[PDB]
Amino acid sequence: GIDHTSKQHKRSGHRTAPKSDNVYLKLLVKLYTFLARRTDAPFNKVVLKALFLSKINRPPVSVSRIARALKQEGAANKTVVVVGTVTDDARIFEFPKTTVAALRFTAGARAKIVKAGGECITLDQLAVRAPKGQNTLILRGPRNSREAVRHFGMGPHKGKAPRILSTGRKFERARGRRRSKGFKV
Amino acid sequence: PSRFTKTRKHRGHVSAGKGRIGKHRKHPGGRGMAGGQHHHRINMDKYHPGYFGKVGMRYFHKQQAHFWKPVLNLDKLWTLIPEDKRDQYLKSASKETAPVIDTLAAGYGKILGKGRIPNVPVIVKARFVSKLAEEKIRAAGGVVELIA
Amino acid sequence: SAQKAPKWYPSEDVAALKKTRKAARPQKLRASLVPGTVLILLAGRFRGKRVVYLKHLEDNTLLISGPFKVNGVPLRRVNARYVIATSTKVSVEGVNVEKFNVEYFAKEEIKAERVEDQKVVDKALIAEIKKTPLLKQYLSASFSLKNGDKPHMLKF
Amino acid sequence: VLKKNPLKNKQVLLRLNPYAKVFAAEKLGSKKAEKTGTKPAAVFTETLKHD
Amino acid sequence: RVKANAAKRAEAKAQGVAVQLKRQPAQPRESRIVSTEGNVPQTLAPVPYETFI
Amino acid sequence: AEQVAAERAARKAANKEKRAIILERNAAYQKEYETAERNIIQAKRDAKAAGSYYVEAQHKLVFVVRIKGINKIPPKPRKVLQLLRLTRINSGTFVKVTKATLELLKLIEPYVAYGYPSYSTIRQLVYKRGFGKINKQRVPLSDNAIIEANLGKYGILSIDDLIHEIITVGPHFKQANNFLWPFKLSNPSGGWGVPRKFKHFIQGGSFGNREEFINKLVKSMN
RNA sequence: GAAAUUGUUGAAAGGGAAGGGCAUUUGAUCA
RNA sequence: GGAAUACUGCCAGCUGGGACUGAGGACUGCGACGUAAGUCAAGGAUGCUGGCAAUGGUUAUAUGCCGCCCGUCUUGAAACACGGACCAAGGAGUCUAACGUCUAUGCGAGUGUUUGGGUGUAAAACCCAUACGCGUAAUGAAAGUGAACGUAGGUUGGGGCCUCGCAAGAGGUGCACAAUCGACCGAUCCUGAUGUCUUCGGAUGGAUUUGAGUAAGAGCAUAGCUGUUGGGACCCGAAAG
RNA sequence: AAAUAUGUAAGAAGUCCUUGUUACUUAAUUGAACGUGGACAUUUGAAUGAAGAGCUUUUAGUGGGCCAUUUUUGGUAAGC
Ligand SMILES: [Mg+2]
Ligand SMILES: [Mg+2]
Ligand SMILES: [Mg+2]
Ligand SMILES: [Mg+2]
Ligand SMILES: [Mg+2]
Ligand SMILES: [Mg+2]
Ligand SMILES: [Mg+2]
Ligand SMILES: [Mg+2]
Ligand SMILES: [Mg+2]
Ligand SMILES: [Mg+2]
Ligand SMILES: [Mg+2]
Ligand SMILES: [Mg+2]
Ligand SMILES: [Mg+2]
Ligand SMILES: [Mg+2]
Ligand SMILES: [Mg+2]
Ligand SMILES: [Mg+2]
Ligand SMILES: [Mg+2]
Ligand SMILES: [Mg+2]
Ligand SMILES: [Mg+2]
Ligand SMILES: [Mg+2]
Ligand SMILES: [Mg+2]
Ligand SMILES: [Mg+2]
Ligand SMILES: [Mg+2]
Ligand SMILES: [Mg+2]
Ligand SMILES: [Mg+2]
Ligand SMILES: [Mg+2]
Ligand SMILES: [Mg+2]
Ligand SMILES: [Mg+2]
Ligand SMILES: [Mg+2]
Ligand SMILES: [Mg+2]
Ligand SMILES: [Mg+2]
Ligand SMILES: [Mg+2]
Ligand SMILES: [Mg+2]
Ligand SMILES: [Mg+2]
Ligand SMILES: [Mg+2]
Ligand SMILES: [Mg+2]
């Protein structure tokens, strides 16, 4: 026998396939298993592993936030990349001259770009434009503001949005929620 | 799909997932939300504070219509303009000859100020409005009239 | 259909084998296998008979005969490990050796061509073996084994 | 696919350690170290067989 | 410890190139002849039992 | 457009010269060993010549083999034999014996057998059972290219340079010993020489320190 | 027209149950 | 005094006897040899000769050794604990509603055809107007009020991208996330300007006080496992009312 | 007044220097806290080891235990 040091026969802990049986994306994975393995371009690793993620580790970037990532000091006229979907945003009009690749686009996505002269490219048409990811900005969606996560690990004095269906007064609001009824949380 | 369950894997495992000591008896805790104040006090003071007692005064025969006042913030407000009409109102921006937007027609009752505006003069009639909205509407040249 | 055959397949290519890095030798033979030693048959039809050691035929068999008119032993191939090494010297030579290579015993009612070679070899030797007294009379006496003998103590 | 061990299979004893073959010429394990004629002191041996 | 560590790195290149700034644990002691001169070994042996109380 | 044999006839000379630079230090090591040890014996006989004792320089390296089974072990002795790569029976490794290294061997003493190994013991031990940790991958050490590749950072490229780098506990002993794998030894050939093996060596048992004796033991566990 | 259970036939075993695991002799039987 | 021998130990000293195994299957490796052809024990066995049309597997019995009857409750069962004489068929975690998590799909600040209409080859499919639900704002018991000082903030770290450097490195930009300090909306406690139907209005600046808030939105719908509660609710079971 | 057991520490989130911010403090530009800007990769600051570490969600069974060495309490004792 052996005085085993750490847990034997433990699996990785990390996704290696987005098991959407989506035959089309199940092709893009096989393409990038090429790149990171035969480029060593550190950009080529990131997006392939970031390709696998489930829908919630894949939040949307909005045309809103991409606009300012080139209001970044020294990016205004460069192409960007983000794995996933991208949404229109009717709250910005100073949209720039630009070009961007992402999994799929909403309606206004391809609108706000054309209205400002931009372009909306599928990423398969990207991989040949920057093999090593030359001059590629990557932005991620804000994973930790989905509605569900706002009650993860709620306890007393952590004040984190109890799980409740009908909301308002009389609904989990008196005892344990003010010193007027016993105590507060 | 029945086969996709896991209770078809418990077949041949006498206690069928529910154990030899603890067995799957019918109602160990009391039926439903029984004993919330006695032997479930942790799981309701925790996860569900404010749950007991009365918290404030009541109102007899209320109607969720008297307080229908949907809020729109200065964020959108130009979606009440077709795009084949707003860029031809962004360029071509003037006090006279100005685009107007009836809030209430879109189904809104109060207008609040969140997200500052393009400066094209817009004059839009609402019923109730937040103060910061009126000011940043007057900063673009426009004003607010009051409908009912 | 009734089974639906697979698609990934092998294919009938007897893969080339790879070098056997092996080098041979004639037996690094036992220390007492000196040509011209009486030896003792242990397996075969004549098994048990006593013989005299001659050429180490290049297929590792060991030519020996009785001579023939001694113990009816023709000149024969033997595997070394089926004959024990006695300790009994013979003469230098007088025997033709070079004729018996490993081919010699290729078989294709009696035979005519090597019977006179055996009758050259035998008299070439018996003229020597009676030089020593009762050794002629000793190999004449086919070997046998007797009761109570402990081989770990018995020399030859 | 397999490990061969030195101290047997003497060919691989030279894949490492080439000095090995110089080792074989000079006995090196039977190196006759050359003698010294120093005699132990007396105040030491007296106490070594002191009761 | 670090104040003593301050100067001892100046002499890294100032004198040569030799630094030695790390701390280290105790070591088995090195070879040391020790002499009989005025120090002859005092042979000893155990003692028997007795009460004396 | 051949480009082929240009880059491969450079390694014949590369290897013949790195072999010639291995040779030099190997011969230098035999020189080192016999000069040091004959100087030791001569200092002993010189102090005995002029009436005194040359005290042995207390040892700087010790070999340790763990024995007792996987099970029924207190938390902290279990922890420390986990802490010295010793998670199996008859496995073993070396220790740089400082006197901080030292006080853990005296916590595991009834589960191990250890002491001071001869050159020849260590050489026979790392020739037959020397293994290297490579992305853990427990590689066997068929030739010196691999310690060249892992420890070209220490001027250490020969197997006997490595032997020297531990039998002399060299300035980068630890970066070498940790690279070495634990040594999967068998049970000793001539038995354990003691009937019940879980008593201290001093007590006719088999655990504890056996200073020059583990040699006889470990050479038997070949 | 199954099992339990039952009869004839045939083969083998059996000193206070039987059945079983391992390897083998022996006999039977499948390249 | 001059030696030999014992004990202990080193040999990269020499040779015999036995046993087990022979994975891999173009070549690719570091070797060894020589002066050079060319060789080899050097990244896993070859070669010669001899034998059967045999030897292999299963089964029954015999021998050697080992083996208490399952299931169950149990700290503890072969138990003098319970059920089980034997056999066939039936024989127990289901469906539903409303839900937690996570996953797959479509669309995306929106989503959701199927109350209903249109249509139809007819319970399918197909197409559709208004509404509606949920989300898109919160917060107070409430009347109520209702999210940019700024490149929507600083700071620490941060993947990736950028610039120089051969490179090592150096700097730049820094999303997700983590931490923290501020800024913004509601609550509460304050501070209380011009104006005055003299009590109205609540400017401005604030705080060891509170919210499940904004701070360049993420959700909505469908389905799947799992989990929850209500249900006959895994299946059989009372004394009772 | 031990043994065993135990709390903090062994650097770059550091150490030096400069004088900026403020409604705190001081008689005081005094100190307080937080920064600008400025300097030192061998041996970046003990030993050893690491199939690498951090972080989140959701949920099963369980909540009758017993034994052994050493410490130990009640009981004469107990397979208490
Ligand atoms: Mg095992
Ligand atoms: Mg309190
Ligand atoms: Mg189970
Ligand atoms: Mg059962
Ligand atoms: Mg279960
Ligand atoms: Mg049960
Ligand atoms: Mg239960
Ligand atoms: Mg034996
Ligand atoms: Mg014993
Ligand atoms: Mg029947
Ligand atoms: Mg009978
Ligand atoms: Mg009877
Ligand atoms: Mg039997
Ligand atoms: Mg000896
Ligand atoms: Mg030897
Ligand atoms: Mg028995
Ligand atoms: Mg009981
Ligand atoms: Mg039982
Ligand atoms: Mg039992
Ligand atoms: Mg009983
Ligand atoms: Mg019962
Ligand atoms: Mg019964
Ligand atoms: Mg019966
Ligand atoms: Mg059935
Ligand atoms: Mg219609
Ligand atoms: Mg219609
Ligand atoms: Mg119509
Ligand atoms: Mg009933
Ligand atoms: Mg009744
Ligand atoms: Mg009643
Ligand atoms: Mg690692
Ligand atoms: Mg749990
Ligand atoms: Mg539970
Ligand atoms: Mg639990
Ligand atoms: Mg219980
Ligand atoms: Mg025990």
Task: Explain this structure.
The structure is cut from a larger assembly and holds chains A (185 residues), B (148 residues), C (156 residues), D (51 residues), E (53 residues) and F (222 residues). Chain A has 185 residues and is of the alpha/beta class. Chain A is built from 4 helices and 5 strands; from the N terminus they run H-H-E-H-E-E-H-E-E. Chain A has a single domain, classed as Ribosomal Protein L15, Chain: K, domain 2. Chain D is an all-alpha fold. In chain D, 35% of the residues lie in helices and 0% in strands. Chain F is an alpha+beta fold and 222 residues long. Chain F has one domain (1-222). Chain F has helices spanning 10-47, 75-83, 102-105, 119-129, 145-151, 159-167, 173-177, 214-220; strands at 52-55, 61-66, 91-96, 112-115, 131-132, 139-140, 183-184, 208-209. In chain F, the strands form 2 sheets. Chain F has a 5-stranded mixed β-sheet. In chain F, helix 4 packs across helix 6. Chains in contact: A-B, A-F, D-E, D-F, E-F. The interface between D and E is small, with 6 and 4 residues. Strand 1 (32-35) of chain E pairs antiparallel with strand 1 (52-55) of chain F. The complex binds magnesium ion (36 copies). One magnesium ion binds at residues 195-196 of chain F. Chain A binds 3 RNA strands through helix 2, strand 1, helix 3, strand 2 and helix 4.
Most strands sheet of chain F: 5 strands, mixed
Strand/helix succession of chain F: HEEHEHEHEEHHHEEH
What is the N-to-C order of secondary-structure elements of chain A (H for helix, E for strand)? HHEHEEHEE
Biggest beta sheet attributes of chain A: 5 strands, parallel
The largest interface is: D-F, 24 and 27 residues
Question: Which hetero ligands occur in this complex?
Answer: magnesium ion
Name the CATH architecture of chain A.
Ribosomal Protein L15, Chain: K, domain 2
Search tags:
part of a larger assembly; 6 chains; D: 51 residues; mainly alpha; elongated; E: 53 residues; alpha+beta; 2 helices; 21% helix; binds magnesium ion; RNA-binding
Task: Briefly characterize the structure.
Chain C is of the alpha+beta class and 156 residues long. Chain C has helices at 68-71, 115-129, 136-139; strands spanning 37-41, 50-56, 62-65, 83-89.
Secondary structure blueprint with pairings:
This is part of a larger assembly, with chains A (185 residues), B (148 residues), C (156 residues), D (51 residues), E (53 residues) and F (222 residues).
Chain A lengths: L24 H15 L2 H11 L8 E2 H8 L9 E8 L11 E7 L1 H9 L3 E3 L15 E2 L47
Helix pairs in contact in A: 1-2
Chain E lengths: L1 H6 L3 H5 L16 E4 L18
Chain F lengths: L9 H38 L4 E4 L5 E6 L8 H9 L7 E6 L5 H4 L6 E4 L3 H11 L1 E2 L6 E2 L4 H7 L7 H9 L5 H5 L5 E2 L23 E2 L4 H7 L2
Parallel strand pairs in F: 4-8
Antiparallel strand pairs in F: 2-3, 2-4, 3-7, 5-6
Helix pairs in contact in F: 4-6
Bound molecules: magnesium ion (36 copies).
The structure holds 3 RNA strands.
